[PDB]
Each structure stands twice: as C-alpha cells, then as structure tokens.
Design a protein around this ligand. Sequence first.
Ligand SMILES: OC[C@H]1O[C@@H](O[C@H]2[C@H](O)[C@@H](O)[C@@H](O)O[C@@H]2CO)[C@H](O)[C@@H](O)[C@H]1O
Ligand SMILES: OC[C@H]1O[C@@H](O[C@H]2[C@H](O)[C@@H](O)[C@H](O)O[C@@H]2CO)[C@H](O)[C@@H](O)[C@H]1O
Lengths: 138, 136
Amino acid sequence: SSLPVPYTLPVSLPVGSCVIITGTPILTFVKDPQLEVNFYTGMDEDSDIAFQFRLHFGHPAIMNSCVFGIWRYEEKCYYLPFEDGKPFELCIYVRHKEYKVMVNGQRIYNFAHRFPPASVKMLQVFRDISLTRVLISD
Amino acid sequence: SSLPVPYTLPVSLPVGSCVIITGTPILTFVKDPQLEVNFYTGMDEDSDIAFQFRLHFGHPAIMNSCVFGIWRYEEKCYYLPFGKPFELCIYVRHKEYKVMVNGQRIYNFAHRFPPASVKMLQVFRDISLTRVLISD
Ligand SMILES: OC[C@H]1O[C@@H](O[C@H]2[C@H](O)[C@@H](O)[C@@H](O)O[C@@H]2CO)[C@H](O)[C@@H](O)[C@H]1O
Ligand SMILES: OC[C@H]1O[C@@H](O[C@H]2[C@H](O)[C@@H](O)[C@H](O)O[C@@H]2CO)[C@H](O)[C@@H](O)[C@H]1O
C-alpha cells in the first residue's frame, strides 16, 4: 500500500478516535524536508484549518553574530543525519479537550481544541513523505 | 568523564585550523536540548560574538490553526526520538567557516569578522563534553 501525496480524505474525528499516519521521509529533494497534516472544517481548500501539524525531519542549526549587544542576521540550515529517512507513525488521538500528538508511539504534545473536534470535515497530508497508511482508529 | 560545561577557552583560529568538539547530547532534562558554541572577539562577557553555532538535538514540530484566512498562535515542541555522540568540526577557511557534523559538511558561514579577531571559545547547554581542541 502506497498513497498519493498530497492526500486528502473526508473524515469524522469524534472523541476517542485517532488519526494514524505512517510513511517514510523523502530527504533527497528539499533542504528542509517536513511533513504537514491539516484538519479542515470544510471541504473547500479555503475553509478554516482547525489543526495543522508540521514536523521537520532534520535538526535545525542556527548561526549568527552579536555586534554591539545585538544579534544580527540569522543563518539557518537543517542537519540531516542519514539519508534514509526513518519510517514513522504519527498518531493524533482526539480527547475531549485536546489532540494528543504521538510520534512513533511517544507523546510529544497536547494541543487544546480551538474548534470542536466535530467541526473537522477533511484531512490533508502532504510534503516530503512517502505515504504508507492513513486511517481513523478507535 | 566530562569536561566542565560551560567550557570556555582562549583560542587562536588561523585559516587552516579546525575547532573540534565531541560529546554526547543530554536529552532528559529540558524540552529543547541544544548545543551552543560561541566565538568571542575578546575575553569579556560583553565581548562581540563573531560566530555562534546552535544545534537543536530534537525535531521541531509546529501546530496552529487558520481562522478567517489568518494563521493564529503557533504552538511549538520538539520530538526527541531514541543521544548518539557527535563530532562538530568548524574548519576555518580564508572566507568562511565550514561547519561539519559527524564528518558531514552542513554549512559555509561567511566571515563577519576576521578570524584572527576571535579570542575565546565558549561551549555550553545540553551536552556531556568529551573533547574540545584546536588542530592546525
Ligand atoms: O540567532 C542567535 C540568537 O537567537 C536568539 O534567539 C532567537 C531565536 O533563534 C529565534 O527563534 C527568535 O524567535 O528569538 C531570537 C531572535 O530574536 C537567542 O536568544 C540568542 O541567544 C542567540 O542564540
Ligand atoms: O503556522 C505555520 C504556518 O505558517 C504559514 O506561513 C505563515 C507564517 O505563519 C508566518 O511566518 C507569516 O506570517 O506568513 C504566513 C501567514 O501568517 C504557512 O503558510 C502555513 O502552512 C503554516 O505552516
């Protein structure tokens, strides 16, 4: 199983459900490879986004100088160790108050709802990933 | 064993020298573990910094909402998987520093001060430091 990218899917995300997204980072085309996941409150792509999750597959490295006490122009790059992306499982579990965000089974964040989870109507997954599965589990 | 952190060291950085820093990241005490290396142009706390290298050991993740076409308050965290020991080499060339992590060149930083202006090295934040040396 392999899915097109960008991937768009009508969804219903009640409390207790989890959005499972598995894939592999593609590190060979862009300098800052990332994964982006959007929960839309409607079906047009000008509808509101109740929740966006963006994950950078590299490590940020930031370089600058400080002259007269003032930090100057920041130069940034993304350190990519290994050019084989590690496969990942993204799990977004829907709780009453928040989305519980898990990467490879490890909770990294709890994003408090800014819309009722019932208002989410569509999911979009795209950028620098080879997509293996996208499903709604309970 | 670990060298003291912060680690501060008077240095001379001629073209052709490399700043070699090895150590292991410490991932268990702060949400955003980093390594910070500063090249100072004098020996004082207030001195100018000719070059700062800051590396995040985690993967940044950013979350937000978009309402009425406007992105709102961005919420940020860092995914820390699995730290493996690292080697950072900052190679001093005529026109730039060549930044090397684990033997991989990741960036060429154009000099903003003459590298002869650098007088002091400082290394600190979330690392167990193994070696700091300058080799020519
Ligand atoms: O660029 C080096 C300096 O950055 C400062 O933090 C930056 C930071 O990189 C950025 O994300 C922004 O949001 O805040 C600061 C820019 O004003 C550090 O505090 C400073 O010590 C230097 O590292
Ligand atoms: O929340 C991330 C958000 O960034 C967008 O670009 C923004 C950005 O928030 C900001 O730096 C600046 O003000 O311009 C844009 C509008 O605010 C991305 O377009 C979007 O996909 C998100 O990733």
